[PDB]
Amino acid sequence: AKTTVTFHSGILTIGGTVIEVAYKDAHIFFDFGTEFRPELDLPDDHIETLINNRLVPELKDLYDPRLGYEYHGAEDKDYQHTAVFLSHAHLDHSRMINYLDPAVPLYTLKETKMILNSLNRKGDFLIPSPFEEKNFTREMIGLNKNDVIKVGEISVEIVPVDHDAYGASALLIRTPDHFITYTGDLRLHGHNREETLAFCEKAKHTELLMMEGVSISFPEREPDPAQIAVVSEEDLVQHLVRLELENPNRQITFNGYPANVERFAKIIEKSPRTVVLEANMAALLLEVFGIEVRYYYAESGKIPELNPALEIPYDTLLKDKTDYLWQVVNQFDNLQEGSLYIHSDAQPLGDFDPQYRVFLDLLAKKDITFVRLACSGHAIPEDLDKIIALIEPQVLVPIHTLKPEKLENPYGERILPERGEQIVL
Ligand SMILES: [Zn+2]
Ligand SMILES: [Zn+2]
Numbered sequence: 001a002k003t004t005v006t007f008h009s010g011i012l013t014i015g016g017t018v019i020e021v022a023y024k025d026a027h028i029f030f031d032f033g034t035e036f037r038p039e040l041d042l043p044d045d046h047i048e049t050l051i052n053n054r055l056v057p058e059l060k061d062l063y064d065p066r067l068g069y070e071y072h073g074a075e076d077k078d079y080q081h082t083a084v085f086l087s088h089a090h091l092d093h094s095r096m097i098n099y100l101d102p103a104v105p106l107y108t109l110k111e112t113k114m115i116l117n118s119l120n121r122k123g124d125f126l127i128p129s130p131f132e133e134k135n136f137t138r139e140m141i142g143l144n145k146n147d148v149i150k151v152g153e154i155s156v157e158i159v160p161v162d163h164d165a166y167g168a169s170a171l172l173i174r175t176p177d178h179f180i181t182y183t184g185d186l187r188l189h190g191h192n193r194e195e196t197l198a199f200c201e202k203a204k205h206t207e208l209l210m211m212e213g214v215s216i217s218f219p220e221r222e223p224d225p226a227q228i229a230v231v232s233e234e235d236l237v238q239h240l241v242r243l244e245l246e247n248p249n250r251q252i253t254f255n256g257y258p259a260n261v262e263r264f265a266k267i268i269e270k271s272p273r274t275v276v277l278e279a280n281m282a283a284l285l286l287e288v289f290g291i292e293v294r295y296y297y298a299e300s301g302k303i304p305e306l307n308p309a310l311e312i313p314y315d316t317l318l319k320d321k322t323d324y325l326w327q328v329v330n331q332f333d334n335l336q337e338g339s340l341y342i343h344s345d346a347q348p349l350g351d352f353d354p355q356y357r358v359f360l361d362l363l364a365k366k367d368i369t370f371v372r373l374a375c376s377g378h379a380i381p382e383d384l385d386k387i388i389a390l391i392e393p394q395v396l397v398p399i400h401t402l403k404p405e406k407l408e409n410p411y412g413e414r415i416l417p418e419r420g421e422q423i424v425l
Pocket of ligand 1: 377
């Protein structure tokens with residue numbers, strides 16, 4: 001019996017990787033986001049629209065049957081055992097999980113499940129199921145680090161990896177004759193570089209390494225004068241500390257991306273000023289780490305989990321110049337003239353986003369100093385080579401990359417996949 005790997009989706013685009021691994025009457029898929037084509041505008045996210053525009057692949061007996069999607073393609077086998085794995089919460093990996101057949105199990109590390117359910121609290125993160133409330137998120141089996149799931153004779157180990165989404169993982173996949181590896185997204189300069197290192201050791205000598213190539217997709221730009229050069233998550237927080245100590249009499253605010261829970265945690269740990277977060281961010285922190293931080297509501301109502309005594313009125317935050325570092329998420333027109341705002345991988349992400357310019361223009365008019373304090377979730381080009389060096393893959397498959405030819409395997413062979421391609425091991 002053959003082990004077949006199929007590259008259904010996500011090729012030559014950063015987002016929407018969907019790979020199938022099949023053996024006998026079992027098959028697994030990972031991940032489950034959609035592709036994004038910024039030059040395309042679509043009126044909706046209906047499955048047919050996504051299919052017709054090639055943003056999701058044609059798949060047999062995987063999408064929720066109630067959607068009324070009819071599979072057409074070459075697939076001629078029925079499977080007794082099916083499962084889907086999710087490397088991490090980021091949109092380009094998770095966006096369509098609500099379209100996954102409820103009967104098919106969906107596996108992820110438990111922290112990813114927490115993150116995602118919070119990202120999707122308003123139902124504008126994930127595509128809604130048309131058969132549930134807009135903010136419904138489908139079931140996920142939250143797993144522990146290094147758990148092994150058996151799907152027929154396929155064995156999948158879910159291994160934690162360092163990425164700017166907390167709970168990020170890689171997959172080590174075994175059938176009786178083969179051992180292959182899917183990196184997910186990863187880096188060596190984050191909060192837990194040793195998890196990536198431990199992953200490489202587990203991945204050593206894998207027959208087929210399916211590896212991201214995000215950082216090599218974009219040529220090094222000319223230095224942004226608004227940007228501090230940051231070399232690690234730890235370095236990022238030291239810079240934030242420095243920025244606070246240089247500005248003892250001044251409103252200081254910041255924002256980050258909520259999936260990076262550990263960055264928020266670290267800021268809280270080291271910030272000379274008392275940190276105050278938006279309530280939903282505080283609640284996520286409490287859920288994931290048991291950390292209780294001061295907070296303000298940017299919405300009406302109450303989150304029951306939060307201690308009412310830790311609430312700071314928004315009105316009080318707006319007046320502060322000495323006591324708080326607080327997370328600003330909207331109403332930027334209320335910040336003080338001459339204040340400091342630290343943009344730490346929050347949206348708008350960068351100049352590829354038309355909102356980025358308008359945001360910076362708004363801040364400028366208010367004489368608010370804007371500081372870009374970014375730290376990539378992705379392995380820098382050097383570290384990508386180091387990861388390959390530590391693993392020594394027999395065959396390397398670049399994925400999640402606009403320049404797969406730049407990713408080299410000194411240790412063996414390389415396959416540059418195209419959409420729909422099957423590799424028979
Ligand atoms: Zn990611
Ligand atoms: Zn990604």
